[PDB]
Amino acid sequence: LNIQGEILCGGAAADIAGRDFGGMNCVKPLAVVRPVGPEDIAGAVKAALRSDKLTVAARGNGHSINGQAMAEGGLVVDMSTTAENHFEVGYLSGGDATAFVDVSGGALWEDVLKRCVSEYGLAPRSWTDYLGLTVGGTLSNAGVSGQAFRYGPQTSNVTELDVVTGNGDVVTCSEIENSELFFSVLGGLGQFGIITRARVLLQPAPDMVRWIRVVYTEFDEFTQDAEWLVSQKNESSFDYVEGFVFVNGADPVNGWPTVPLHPDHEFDPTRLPQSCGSVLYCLELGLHYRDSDSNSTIDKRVERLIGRLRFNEGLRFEVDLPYVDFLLRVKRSEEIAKENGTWETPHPWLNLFVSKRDIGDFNRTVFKELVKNGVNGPMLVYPLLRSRWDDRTSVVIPEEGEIFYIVALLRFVPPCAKVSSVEKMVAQNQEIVHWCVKNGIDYKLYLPHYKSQEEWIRHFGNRWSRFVDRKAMFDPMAILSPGQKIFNRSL
Ligand SMILES: *Cc1cc2c(cc1C)nc1c(=O)[nH]c(=O)nc-1n2C[C@H](O)[C@H](O)[C@H](O)COP(=O)(O)OP(=O)(O)OC[C@H]1O[C@@H](n2cnc3c(N)ncnc32)[C@H](O)[C@@H]1O
């Protein structure tokens, strides 16, 4: 194959393309392709199509948990070498979003953020918690954070893509042009093509965020309050709503020390009622405001907005920081992980959506029993609104209810733990999924990983035939993102 970029066989390049953040799969490619642009990528795709066995996997920033960006004896396309290929801002008169920016599928969101803000005072309006992820990587899944209840996930905030299809075609698509490909690729787990450019929506960048954390002991009250907040009329409430479960104890990694937002206000556990469960709940809120706003005016606004919430008195923590610093807040957690050596150990992360109707049951068995001593990392749980998620996309969410929850068990492995430790974590993730399937819980995995056809058929449900149809159209040989394990390469 003749390309402008570099082709690397074996060595450190292959080692890296055979690793991901999951830290549980090592699958080496024949070669790593470092493309200059869409032509190098379609070349890689066409090479694989001519061969008997080659497959092609785009690699974003290697944040997958279960080998989804790996290609056993295939070609891994390191998208980072395309990270700077696009940066064009345009305006929108159609109301809603102010503007859009064209960015590479290989750009990291952290870089997109910094450049939009510094050059234009604009920024995307829907995020992930962690910004060391690629545009094409998150758009291939959903891209979820505390703004999604208001604007939908990142797949709801893109209006055009350039895609290199599994046929090797370079195609521009949108709601109006090649719409089937557009909707297929969004949330499509890399199955239908490689995103080389995305037109991402922009709004004016806020100056500041008031970041608030308040604590609940009662899951019913926590979820009622959170659902109420995400259901409020546009711009009458907060601009970010998340939640998390924490251990009722002093464990610095799992317990109440994880709650405070600055070193000068600590968690006082004597404010907790005597009857508290094994775990407690934190509602996390963000209010955007202007540099010019009077502090008393903002204080009064926040007291009004928080004033009906039923959190435990004396367990309210807040800080104010620039908007960019708020969006990059998880850098602090990355630093704690590198310090305790758990950034480089395996991460058997479990991510799923649960209907509003079943989140109570999930809390009862999962949070209050299975992981009641924590998982050594975040246990996130917060509500989302179905109205913001377009069902034409490949994304798969729970079957019933206008509100559903996202849940994340962000497991970390202490560096002196046995390999049996990681096995036990994986086994417990499986035990949770089984418990869901057995008890008819309306759940769907996010970043799903299954190895059997019957599990994928169950996952896609009434959208399985559509998924298969889209595959037959855009990657009939099944060469793309084989590590998702949904389709096996054609013989
Ligand atoms: C590591 C991690 C992940 C993460 C996170 C925090 C950490 C530390 N926080 C998230 C969050 O707050 N909200 C959210 O929705 N996701 C969060 N993630 C998970 C993350 O989205 C996934 O890891 C995702 O895969 C993006 O990561 P990355 O950009 O590194 O992409 P990848 O893992 O290498 O590839 C994922 C799949 O998509 C295919 N792929 C990669 N690039 C493309 C392009 N450009 N076009 C089409 N497909 C692509 C890969 O082959 C793989 O199948």
Side-chain angles (χ1 to χ4, degrees), residues 58 60-64 68 129-130 134 137 140-141 144 193 195 349 446 481 484:
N61 197 35
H63 265 269
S64 291
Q68 291 99 320
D129 297 334
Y130 179 79
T134 69
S140 289
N141 289 283
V144 186
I195 300 163
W349 280 14
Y446 175 49
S481 288
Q484 297 277 350

mmCIF file with all atom_site columns, all heavy atoms in Angstrom, residues 58 60-64 68 129-130 134 137 140-141 144 193 195 349 446 481 484, ligand 1:
data_model
loop_
_atom_site.group_PDB
_atom_site.id
_atom_site.type_symbol
_atom_site.label_atom_id
_atom_site.label_alt_id
_atom_site.label_comp_id
_atom_site.label_asym_id
_atom_site.label_entity_id
_atom_site.label_seq_id
_atom_site.pdbx_PDB_ins_code
_atom_site.Cartn_x
_atom_site.Cartn_y
_atom_site.Cartn_z
_atom_site.occupancy
_atom_site.B_iso_or_equiv
_atom_site.pdbx_formal_charge
_atom_site.auth_seq_id
_atom_site.auth_comp_id
_atom_site.auth_asym_id
_atom_site.auth_atom_id
_atom_site.pdbx_PDB_model_num
ATOM   1   N N   . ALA A 1 58  ? -9.224  2.014  13.691 1.00 0.00 ? 58  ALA A N   1
ATOM   2   C CA  . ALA A 1 58  ? -8.789  3.354  14.032 1.00 0.00 ? 58  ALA A CA  1
ATOM   3   C C   . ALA A 1 58  ? -8.534  3.387  15.519 1.00 0.00 ? 58  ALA A C   1
ATOM   4   O O   . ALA A 1 58  ? -9.347  2.868  16.290 1.00 0.00 ? 58  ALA A O   1
ATOM   5   C CB  . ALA A 1 58  ? -9.875  4.362  13.664 1.00 0.00 ? 58  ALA A CB  1
ATOM   6   N N   . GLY A 1 60  ? -7.962  6.045  18.656 1.00 0.00 ? 60  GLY A N   1
ATOM   7   C CA  . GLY A 1 60  ? -8.145  7.443  19.064 1.00 0.00 ? 60  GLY A CA  1
ATOM   8   C C   . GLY A 1 60  ? -7.047  7.831  19.997 1.00 0.00 ? 60  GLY A C   1
ATOM   9   O O   . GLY A 1 60  ? -5.962  8.266  19.563 1.00 0.00 ? 60  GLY A O   1
ATOM   10  N N   . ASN A 1 61  ? -7.280  7.654  21.287 1.00 0.00 ? 61  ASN A N   1
ATOM   11  C CA  . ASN A 1 61  ? -6.248  7.874  22.276 1.00 0.00 ? 61  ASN A CA  1
ATOM   12  C C   . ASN A 1 61  ? -6.080  6.656  23.167 1.00 0.00 ? 61  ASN A C   1
ATOM   13  O O   . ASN A 1 61  ? -5.519  6.754  24.246 1.00 0.00 ? 61  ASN A O   1
ATOM   14  C CB  . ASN A 1 61  ? -6.566  9.142  23.087 1.00 0.00 ? 61  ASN A CB  1
ATOM   15  C CG  . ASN A 1 61  ? -5.357  9.690  23.847 1.00 0.00 ? 61  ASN A CG  1
ATOM   16  O OD1 . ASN A 1 61  ? -4.208  9.610  23.376 1.00 0.00 ? 61  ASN A OD1 1
ATOM   17  N ND2 . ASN A 1 61  ? -5.610  10.245 25.028 1.00 0.00 ? 61  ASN A ND2 1
ATOM   18  N N   . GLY A 1 62  ? -6.562  5.511  22.685 1.00 0.00 ? 62  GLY A N   1
ATOM   19  C CA  . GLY A 1 62  ? -6.420  4.226  23.391 1.00 0.00 ? 62  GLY A CA  1
ATOM   20  C C   . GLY A 1 62  ? -7.145  4.106  24.711 1.00 0.00 ? 62  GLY A C   1
ATOM   21  O O   . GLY A 1 62  ? -6.706  3.388  25.613 1.00 0.00 ? 62  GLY A O   1
ATOM   22  N N   . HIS A 1 63  ? -8.264  4.820  24.827 1.00 0.00 ? 63  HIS A N   1
ATOM   23  C CA  . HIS A 1 63  ? -9.033  4.802  26.075 1.00 0.00 ? 63  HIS A CA  1
ATOM   24  C C   . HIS A 1 63  ? -10.036 3.664  26.242 1.00 0.00 ? 63  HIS A C   1
ATOM   25  O O   . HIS A 1 63  ? -10.699 3.576  27.286 1.00 0.00 ? 63  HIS A O   1
ATOM   26  C CB  . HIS A 1 63  ? -9.627  6.180  26.369 1.00 0.00 ? 63  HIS A CB  1
ATOM   27  C CG  . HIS A 1 63  ? -8.743  6.950  27.287 1.00 0.00 ? 63  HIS A CG  1
ATOM   28  N ND1 . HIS A 1 63  ? -8.873  6.913  28.661 1.00 0.00 ? 63  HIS A ND1 1
ATOM   29  C CD2 . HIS A 1 63  ? -7.602  7.638  27.028 1.00 0.00 ? 63  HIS A CD2 1
ATOM   30  C CE1 . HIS A 1 63  ? -7.887  7.608  29.206 1.00 0.00 ? 63  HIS A CE1 1
ATOM   31  N NE2 . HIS A 1 63  ? -7.097  8.049  28.235 1.00 0.00 ? 63  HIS A NE2 1
ATOM   32  N N   . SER A 1 64  ? -10.094 2.786  25.241 1.00 0.00 ? 64  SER A N   1
ATOM   33  C CA  . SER A 1 64  ? -10.968 1.626  25.312 1.00 0.00 ? 64  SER A CA  1
ATOM   34  C C   . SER A 1 64  ? -10.595 0.723  26.489 1.00 0.00 ? 64  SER A C   1
ATOM   35  O O   . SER A 1 64  ? -9.433  0.687  26.960 1.00 0.00 ? 64  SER A O   1
ATOM   36  C CB  . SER A 1 64  ? -10.996 0.842  24.000 1.00 0.00 ? 64  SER A CB  1
ATOM   37  O OG  . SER A 1 64  ? -11.636 1.527  22.935 1.00 0.00 ? 64  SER A OG  1
ATOM   38  N N   . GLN A 1 68  ? -11.297 -2.677 22.018 1.00 0.00 ? 68  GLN A N   1
ATOM   39  C CA  . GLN A 1 68  ? -12.132 -2.237 20.900 1.00 0.00 ? 68  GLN A CA  1
ATOM   40  C C   . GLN A 1 68  ? -11.376 -1.559 19.750 1.00 0.00 ? 68  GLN A C   1
ATOM   41  O O   . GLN A 1 68  ? -11.869 -1.531 18.623 1.00 0.00 ? 68  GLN A O   1
ATOM   42  C CB  . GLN A 1 68  ? -13.259 -1.306 21.391 1.00 0.00 ? 68  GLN A CB  1
ATOM   43  C CG  . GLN A 1 68  ? -14.328 -2.034 22.239 1.00 0.00 ? 68  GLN A CG  1
ATOM   44  C CD  . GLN A 1 68  ? -14.129 -1.870 23.732 1.00 0.00 ? 68  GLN A CD  1
ATOM   45  O OE1 . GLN A 1 68  ? -13.005 -1.912 24.245 1.00 0.00 ? 68  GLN A OE1 1
ATOM   46  N NE2 . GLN A 1 68  ? -15.238 -1.726 24.464 1.00 0.00 ? 68  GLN A NE2 1
ATOM   47  N N   . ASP A 1 129 ? -16.510 13.773 30.773 1.00 0.00 ? 129 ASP A N   1
ATOM   48  C CA  . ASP A 1 129 ? -15.857 14.197 32.012 1.00 0.00 ? 129 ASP A CA  1
ATOM   49  C C   . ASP A 1 129 ? -14.362 14.351 31.776 1.00 0.00 ? 129 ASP A C   1
ATOM   50  O O   . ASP A 1 129 ? -13.733 15.225 32.373 1.00 0.00 ? 129 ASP A O   1
ATOM   51  C CB  . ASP A 1 129 ? -16.056 13.194 33.146 1.00 0.00 ? 129 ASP A CB  1
ATOM   52  C CG  . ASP A 1 129 ? -17.516 13.039 33.543 1.00 0.00 ? 129 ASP A CG  1
ATOM   53  O OD1 . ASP A 1 129 ? -18.304 14.005 33.324 1.00 0.00 ? 129 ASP A OD1 1
ATOM   54  O OD2 . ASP A 1 129 ? -17.879 11.968 34.095 1.00 0.00 ? 129 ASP A OD2 1
ATOM   55  N N   . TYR A 1 130 ? -13.825 13.470 30.929 1.00 0.00 ? 130 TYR A N   1
ATOM   56  C CA  . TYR A 1 130 ? -12.387 13.407 30.740 1.00 0.00 ? 130 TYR A CA  1
ATOM   57  C C   . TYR A 1 130 ? -12.122 13.827 29.310 1.00 0.00 ? 130 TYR A C   1
ATOM   58  O O   . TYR A 1 130 ? -12.723 13.285 28.342 1.00 0.00 ? 130 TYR A O   1
ATOM   59  C CB  . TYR A 1 130 ? -11.892 11.989 31.047 1.00 0.00 ? 130 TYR A CB  1
ATOM   60  C CG  . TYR A 1 130 ? -10.392 11.862 30.850 1.00 0.00 ? 130 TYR A CG  1
ATOM   61  C CD1 . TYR A 1 130 ? -9.533  12.331 31.829 1.00 0.00 ? 130 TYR A CD1 1
ATOM   62  C CD2 . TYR A 1 130 ? -9.854  11.314 29.669 1.00 0.00 ? 130 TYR A CD2 1
ATOM   63  C CE1 . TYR A 1 130 ? -8.140  12.223 31.684 1.00 0.00 ? 130 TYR A CE1 1
ATOM   64  C CE2 . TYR A 1 130 ? -8.455  11.199 29.510 1.00 0.00 ? 130 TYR A CE2 1
ATOM   65  C CZ  . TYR A 1 130 ? -7.625  11.666 30.531 1.00 0.00 ? 130 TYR A CZ  1
ATOM   66  O OH  . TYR A 1 130 ? -6.245  11.555 30.407 1.00 0.00 ? 130 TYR A OH  1
ATOM   67  N N   . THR A 1 134 ? -10.509 11.334 21.880 1.00 0.00 ? 134 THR A N   1
ATOM   68  C CA  . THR A 1 134 ? -10.644 11.937 20.544 1.00 0.00 ? 134 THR A CA  1
ATOM   69  C C   . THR A 1 134 ? -12.071 12.228 20.165 1.00 0.00 ? 134 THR A C   1
ATOM   70  O O   . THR A 1 134 ? -13.004 11.603 20.672 1.00 0.00 ? 134 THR A O   1
ATOM   71  C CB  . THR A 1 134 ? -9.995  11.098 19.415 1.00 0.00 ? 134 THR A CB  1
ATOM   72  O OG1 . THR A 1 134 ? -10.733 9.885  19.222 1.00 0.00 ? 134 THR A OG1 1
ATOM   73  C CG2 . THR A 1 134 ? -8.542  10.791 19.770 1.00 0.00 ? 134 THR A CG2 1
ATOM   74  N N   . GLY A 1 137 ? -13.454 9.142  18.441 1.00 0.00 ? 137 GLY A N   1
ATOM   75  C CA  . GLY A 1 137 ? -13.598 8.110  19.511 1.00 0.00 ? 137 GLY A CA  1
ATOM   76  C C   . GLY A 1 137 ? -14.903 8.278  20.296 1.00 0.00 ? 137 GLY A C   1
ATOM   77  O O   . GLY A 1 137 ? -15.712 7.353  20.399 1.00 0.00 ? 137 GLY A O   1
ATOM   78  N N   . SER A 1 140 ? -18.081 7.943  18.145 1.00 0.00 ? 140 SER A N   1
ATOM   79  C CA  . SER A 1 140 ? -18.363 6.534  17.845 1.00 0.00 ? 140 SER A CA  1
ATOM   80  C C   . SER A 1 140 ? -19.090 5.820  19.002 1.00 0.00 ? 140 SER A C   1
ATOM   81  O O   . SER A 1 140 ? -19.523 4.661  18.866 1.00 0.00 ? 140 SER A O   1
ATOM   82  C CB  . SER A 1 140 ? -17.069 5.802  17.487 1.00 0.00 ? 140 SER A CB  1
ATOM   83  O OG  . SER A 1 140 ? -16.625 6.243  16.215 1.00 0.00 ? 140 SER A OG  1
ATOM   84  N N   . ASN A 1 141 ? -19.260 6.513  20.128 1.00 0.00 ? 141 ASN A N   1
ATOM   85  C CA  . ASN A 1 141 ? -19.932 5.938  21.276 1.00 0.00 ? 141 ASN A CA  1
ATOM   86  C C   . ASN A 1 141 ? -21.156 6.761  21.665 1.00 0.00 ? 141 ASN A C   1
ATOM   87  O O   . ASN A 1 141 ? -22.280 6.340  21.419 1.00 0.00 ? 141 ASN A O   1
ATOM   88  C CB  . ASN A 1 141 ? -18.960 5.769  22.438 1.00 0.00 ? 141 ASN A CB  1
ATOM   89  C CG  . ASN A 1 141 ? -17.973 4.655  22.171 1.00 0.00 ? 141 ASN A CG  1
ATOM   90  O OD1 . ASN A 1 141 ? -18.332 3.488  22.293 1.00 0.00 ? 141 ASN A OD1 1
ATOM   91  N ND2 . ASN A 1 141 ? -16.754 5.003  21.716 1.00 0.00 ? 141 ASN A ND2 1
ATOM   92  N N   . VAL A 1 144 ? -20.677 11.419 26.878 1.00 0.00 ? 144 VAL A N   1
ATOM   93  C CA  . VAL A 1 144 ? -21.639 11.780 27.917 1.00 0.00 ? 144 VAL A CA  1
ATOM   94  C C   . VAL A 1 144 ? -21.006 12.498 29.087 1.00 0.00 ? 144 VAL A C   1
ATOM   95  O O   . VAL A 1 144 ? -19.958 12.049 29.619 1.00 0.00 ? 144 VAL A O   1
ATOM   96  C CB  . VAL A 1 144 ? -22.391 10.538 28.479 1.00 0.00 ? 144 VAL A CB  1
ATOM   97  C CG1 . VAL A 1 144 ? -23.506 10.980 29.465 1.00 0.00 ? 144 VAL A CG1 1
ATOM   98  C CG2 . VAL A 1 144 ? -22.986 9.712  27.356 1.00 0.00 ? 144 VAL A CG2 1
ATOM   99  N N   . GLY A 1 193 ? -17.362 3.109  9.350  1.00 0.00 ? 193 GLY A N   1
ATOM   100 C CA  . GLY A 1 193 ? -16.364 3.970  8.751  1.00 0.00 ? 193 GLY A CA  1
ATOM   101 C C   . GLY A 1 193 ? -15.592 4.728  9.791  1.00 0.00 ? 193 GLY A C   1
ATOM   102 O O   . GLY A 1 193 ? -15.978 4.761  10.973 1.00 0.00 ? 193 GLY A O   1
ATOM   103 N N   . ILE A 1 195 ? -14.257 8.269  11.131 1.00 0.00 ? 195 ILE A N   1
ATOM   104 C CA  . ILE A 1 195 ? -14.553 9.700  11.131 1.00 0.00 ? 195 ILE A CA  1
ATOM   105 C C   . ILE A 1 195 ? -13.247 10.479 11.024 1.00 0.00 ? 195 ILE A C   1
ATOM   106 O O   . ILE A 1 195 ? -12.368 10.398 11.899 1.00 0.00 ? 195 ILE A O   1
ATOM   107 C CB  . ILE A 1 195 ? -15.322 10.138 12.392 1.00 0.00 ? 195 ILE A CB  1
ATOM   108 C CG1 . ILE A 1 195 ? -16.663 9.409  12.514 1.00 0.00 ? 195 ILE A CG1 1
ATOM   109 C CG2 . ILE A 1 195 ? -15.576 11.674 12.363 1.00 0.00 ? 195 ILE A CG2 1
ATOM   110 C CD1 . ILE A 1 195 ? -17.238 9.519  13.979 1.00 0.00 ? 195 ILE A CD1 1
ATOM   111 N N   . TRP A 1 349 ? -13.411 -1.269 33.892 1.00 0.00 ? 349 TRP A N   1
ATOM   112 C CA  . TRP A 1 349 ? -14.513 -0.310 34.023 1.00 0.00 ? 349 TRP A CA  1
ATOM   113 C C   . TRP A 1 349 ? -15.822 -0.877 33.474 1.00 0.00 ? 349 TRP A C   1
ATOM   114 O O   . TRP A 1 349 ? -15.828 -1.519 32.423 1.00 0.00 ? 349 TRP A O   1
ATOM   115 C CB  . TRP A 1 349 ? -14.110 0.930  33.233 1.00 0.00 ? 349 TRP A CB  1
ATOM   116 C CG  . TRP A 1 349 ? -13.179 1.817  33.986 1.00 0.00 ? 349 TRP A CG  1
ATOM   117 C CD1 . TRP A 1 349 ? -12.489 1.502  35.102 1.00 0.00 ? 349 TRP A CD1 1
ATOM   118 C CD2 . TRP A 1 349 ? -12.835 3.181  33.674 1.00 0.00 ? 349 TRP A CD2 1
ATOM   119 N NE1 . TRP A 1 349 ? -11.756 2.579  35.538 1.00 0.00 ? 349 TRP A NE1 1
ATOM   120 C CE2 . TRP A 1 349 ? -11.960 3.626  34.682 1.00 0.00 ? 349 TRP A CE2 1
ATOM   121 C CE3 . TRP A 1 349 ? -13.210 4.077  32.651 1.00 0.00 ? 349 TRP A CE3 1
ATOM   122 C CZ2 . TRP A 1 349 ? -11.435 4.931  34.712 1.00 0.00 ? 349 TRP A CZ2 1
ATOM   123 C CZ3 . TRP A 1 349 ? -12.687 5.389  32.686 1.00 0.00 ? 349 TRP A CZ3 1
ATOM   124 C CH2 . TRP A 1 349 ? -11.805 5.787  33.691 1.00 0.00 ? 349 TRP A CH2 1
ATOM   125 N N   . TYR A 1 446 ? -23.072 0.780  28.011 1.00 0.00 ? 446 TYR A N   1
ATOM   126 C CA  . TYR A 1 446 ? -22.473 1.867  27.222 1.00 0.00 ? 446 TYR A CA  1
ATOM   127 C C   . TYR A 1 446 ? -21.014 1.420  27.034 1.00 0.00 ? 446 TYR A C   1
ATOM   128 O O   . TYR A 1 446 ? -20.467 0.796  27.937 1.00 0.00 ? 446 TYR A O   1
ATOM   129 C CB  . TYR A 1 446 ? -22.591 3.175  28.038 1.00 0.00 ? 446 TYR A CB  1
ATOM   130 C CG  . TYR A 1 446 ? -21.912 4.354  27.417 1.00 0.00 ? 446 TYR A CG  1
ATOM   131 C CD1 . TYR A 1 446 ? -22.129 4.670  26.073 1.00 0.00 ? 446 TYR A CD1 1
ATOM   132 C CD2 . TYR A 1 446 ? -21.065 5.172  28.183 1.00 0.00 ? 446 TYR A CD2 1
ATOM   133 C CE1 . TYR A 1 446 ? -21.490 5.781  25.469 1.00 0.00 ? 446 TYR A CE1 1
ATOM   134 C CE2 . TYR A 1 446 ? -20.406 6.273  27.584 1.00 0.00 ? 446 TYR A CE2 1
ATOM   135 C CZ  . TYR A 1 446 ? -20.625 6.553  26.241 1.00 0.00 ? 446 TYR A CZ  1
ATOM   136 O OH  . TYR A 1 446 ? -19.992 7.622  25.667 1.00 0.00 ? 446 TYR A OH  1
ATOM   137 N N   . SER A 1 481 ? -12.933 -1.970 12.853 1.00 0.00 ? 481 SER A N   1
ATOM   138 C CA  . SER A 1 481 ? -13.013 -2.067 14.303 1.00 0.00 ? 481 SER A CA  1
ATOM   139 C C   . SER A 1 481 ? -13.410 -3.487 14.728 1.00 0.00 ? 481 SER A C   1
ATOM   140 O O   . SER A 1 481 ? -14.414 -3.688 15.404 1.00 0.00 ? 481 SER A O   1
ATOM   141 C CB  . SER A 1 481 ? -13.983 -1.018 14.895 1.00 0.00 ? 481 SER A CB  1
ATOM   142 O OG  . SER A 1 481 ? -13.422 0.285  14.827 1.00 0.00 ? 481 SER A OG  1
ATOM   143 N N   . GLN A 1 484 ? -14.468 -4.754 18.377 1.00 0.00 ? 484 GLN A N   1
ATOM   144 C CA  . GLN A 1 484 ? -15.798 -4.632 18.980 1.00 0.00 ? 484 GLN A CA  1
ATOM   145 C C   . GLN A 1 484 ? -16.443 -6.013 19.053 1.00 0.00 ? 484 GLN A C   1
ATOM   146 O O   . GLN A 1 484 ? -17.358 -6.223 19.849 1.00 0.00 ? 484 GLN A O   1
ATOM   147 C CB  . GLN A 1 484 ? -16.689 -3.646 18.189 1.00 0.00 ? 484 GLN A CB  1
ATOM   148 C CG  . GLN A 1 484 ? -16.155 -2.209 18.188 1.00 0.00 ? 484 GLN A CG  1
ATOM   149 C CD  . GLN A 1 484 ? -16.534 -1.446 19.437 1.00 0.00 ? 484 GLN A CD  1
ATOM   150 O OE1 . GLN A 1 484 ? -17.342 -1.920 20.232 1.00 0.00 ? 484 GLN A OE1 1
ATOM   151 N NE2 . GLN A 1 484 ? -15.986 -0.208 19.597 1.00 0.00 ? 484 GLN A NE2 1
HETATM 152 C C1  . LIG B 2 .   ? -9.870  6.337  29.440 1.00 0.00 ? 1   LIG B C1  1
HETATM 153 C C2  . LIG B 2 .   ? -11.160 7.080  29.797 1.00 0.00 ? 1   LIG B C2  1
HETATM 154 C C3  . LIG B 2 .   ? -12.293 6.995  28.961 1.00 0.00 ? 1   LIG B C3  1
HETATM 155 C C4  . LIG B 2 .   ? -13.425 7.813  29.212 1.00 0.00 ? 1   LIG B C4  1
HETATM 156 C C5  . LIG B 2 .   ? -13.432 8.691  30.299 1.00 0.00 ? 1   LIG B C5  1
HETATM 157 C C6  . LIG B 2 .   ? -12.327 8.761  31.154 1.00 0.00 ? 1   LIG B C6  1
HETATM 158 C C7  . LIG B 2 .   ? -11.198 7.955  30.906 1.00 0.00 ? 1   LIG B C7  1
HETATM 159 C C8  . LIG B 2 .   ? -9.974  8.231  31.723 1.00 0.00 ? 1   LIG B C8  1
HETATM 160 N N1  . LIG B 2 .   ? -14.546 9.489  30.557 1.00 0.00 ? 1   LIG B N1  1
HETATM 161 C C9  . LIG B 2 .   ? -15.651 9.448  29.746 1.00 0.00 ? 1   LIG B C9  1
HETATM 162 C C10 . LIG B 2 .   ? -16.758 10.259 30.006 1.00 0.00 ? 1   LIG B C10 1
HETATM 163 O O1  . LIG B 2 .   ? -16.747 11.062 30.934 1.00 0.00 ? 1   LIG B O1  1
HETATM 164 N N2  . LIG B 2 .   ? -17.843 10.185 29.156 1.00 0.00 ? 1   LIG B N2  1
HETATM 165 C C11 . LIG B 2 .   ? -17.854 9.346  28.059 1.00 0.00 ? 1   LIG B C11 1
HETATM 166 O O2  . LIG B 2 .   ? -18.818 9.273  27.298 1.00 0.00 ? 1   LIG B O2  1
HETATM 167 N N3  . LIG B 2 .   ? -16.749 8.538  27.810 1.00 0.00 ? 1   LIG B N3  1
HETATM 168 C C12 . LIG B 2 .   ? -15.670 8.575  28.661 1.00 0.00 ? 1   LIG B C12 1
HETATM 169 N N4  . LIG B 2 .   ? -14.569 7.744  28.397 1.00 0.00 ? 1   LIG B N4  1
HETATM 170 C C13 . LIG B 2 .   ? -14.796 6.594  27.458 1.00 0.00 ? 1   LIG B C13 1
HETATM 171 C C14 . LIG B 2 .   ? -14.414 7.016  26.028 1.00 0.00 ? 1   LIG B C14 1
HETATM 172 O O3  . LIG B 2 .   ? -15.456 7.752  25.404 1.00 0.00 ? 1   LIG B O3  1
HETATM 173 C C15 . LIG B 2 .   ? -14.045 5.767  25.205 1.00 0.00 ? 1   LIG B C15 1
HETATM 174 O O4  . LIG B 2 .   ? -12.801 5.253  25.672 1.00 0.00 ? 1   LIG B O4  1
HETATM 175 C C16 . LIG B 2 .   ? -14.020 6.089  23.721 1.00 0.00 ? 1   LIG B C16 1
HETATM 176 O O5  . LIG B 2 .   ? -13.645 4.896  23.029 1.00 0.00 ? 1   LIG B O5  1
HETATM 177 C C17 . LIG B 2 .   ? -13.136 7.254  23.266 1.00 0.00 ? 1   LIG B C17 1
HETATM 178 O O6  . LIG B 2 .   ? -11.764 6.984  23.543 1.00 0.00 ? 1   LIG B O6  1
HETATM 179 P P1  . LIG B 2 .   ? -10.714 7.146  22.343 1.00 0.00 ? 1   LIG B P1  1
HETATM 180 O O7  . LIG B 2 .   ? -10.922 8.465  21.687 1.00 0.00 ? 1   LIG B O7  1
HETATM 181 O O8  . LIG B 2 .   ? -9.370  6.922  22.988 1.00 0.00 ? 1   LIG B O8  1
HETATM 182 O O9  . LIG B 2 .   ? -11.089 6.119  21.150 1.00 0.00 ? 1   LIG B O9  1
HETATM 183 P P2  . LIG B 2 .   ? -10.628 4.549  21.181 1.00 0.00 ? 1   LIG B P2  1
HETATM 184 O O10 . LIG B 2 .   ? -10.815 3.919  22.516 1.00 0.00 ? 1   LIG B O10 1
HETATM 185 O O11 . LIG B 2 .   ? -9.190  4.502  20.701 1.00 0.00 ? 1   LIG B O11 1
HETATM 186 O O12 . LIG B 2 .   ? -11.551 3.948  20.065 1.00 0.00 ? 1   LIG B O12 1
HETATM 187 C C18 . LIG B 2 .   ? -12.894 3.594  20.370 1.00 0.00 ? 1   LIG B C18 1
HETATM 188 C C19 . LIG B 2 .   ? -13.596 2.840  19.237 1.00 0.00 ? 1   LIG B C19 1
HETATM 189 O O13 . LIG B 2 .   ? -13.867 3.703  18.150 1.00 0.00 ? 1   LIG B O13 1
HETATM 190 C C20 . LIG B 2 .   ? -13.043 3.358  17.045 1.00 0.00 ? 1   LIG B C20 1
HETATM 191 N N5  . LIG B 2 .   ? -12.493 4.632  16.578 1.00 0.00 ? 1   LIG B N5  1
HETATM 192 C C21 . LIG B 2 .   ? -11.441 5.368  17.074 1.00 0.00 ? 1   LIG B C21 1
HETATM 193 N N6  . LIG B 2 .   ? -11.340 6.488  16.313 1.00 0.00 ? 1   LIG B N6  1
HETATM 194 C C22 . LIG B 2 .   ? -12.313 6.482  15.374 1.00 0.00 ? 1   LIG B C22 1
HETATM 195 C C23 . LIG B 2 .   ? -12.679 7.354  14.342 1.00 0.00 ? 1   LIG B C23 1
HETATM 196 N N7  . LIG B 2 .   ? -12.033 8.510  14.145 1.00 0.00 ? 1   LIG B N7  1
HETATM 197 N N8  . LIG B 2 .   ? -13.747 7.025  13.543 1.00 0.00 ? 1   LIG B N8  1
HETATM 198 C C24 . LIG B 2 .   ? -14.459 5.854  13.724 1.00 0.00 ? 1   LIG B C24 1
HETATM 199 N N9  . LIG B 2 .   ? -14.094 4.998  14.726 1.00 0.00 ? 1   LIG B N9  1
HETATM 200 C C25 . LIG B 2 .   ? -13.033 5.297  15.522 1.00 0.00 ? 1   LIG B C25 1
HETATM 201 C C26 . LIG B 2 .   ? -11.990 2.358  17.548 1.00 0.00 ? 1   LIG B C26 1
HETATM 202 O O14 . LIG B 2 .   ? -11.554 1.412  16.566 1.00 0.00 ? 1   LIG B O14 1
HETATM 203 C C27 . LIG B 2 .   ? -12.733 1.705  18.684 1.00 0.00 ? 1   LIG B C27 1
HETATM 204 O O15 . LIG B 2 .   ? -13.542 0.673  18.131 1.00 0.00 ? 1   LIG B O15 1
#
